[PDB]
Design a protein around this ligand. Sequence first.
Ligand SMILES: CN[C@H]1CCCN(c2cccnn2)C1
Length: 93
Amino acid sequence: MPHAFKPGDLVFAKMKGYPHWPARIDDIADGAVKPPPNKYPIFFFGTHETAFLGPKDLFPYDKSKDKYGKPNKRKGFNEGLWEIQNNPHASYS
Ligand SMILES: CN[C@H]1CCCN(c2cccnn2)C1
């Protein structure tokens, strides 16, 4: 049975105006800005951007990749697909 989201989990993350996007739940570094309550720091593969999202916009990657893991024309998306498949836990700093 599912647990709550934790750092390192792989997802497709939905934002307004954008396709479900390959991403991961990030950790929060000592001294860094924390998310709002009930929100997680989401690192978007390919764009390397961070946004804060709640579970309603988070789709676990294994269950969802057949639907959402196809090439997209949008900037960064196909790099993102490579990252989540090939090195999803690397530093992209
Ligand atoms: C994939 N393009 C969007 C997706 C959602 C995350 N976006 C953010 C969030 C915070 C800052 N900059 N960009 C970029």
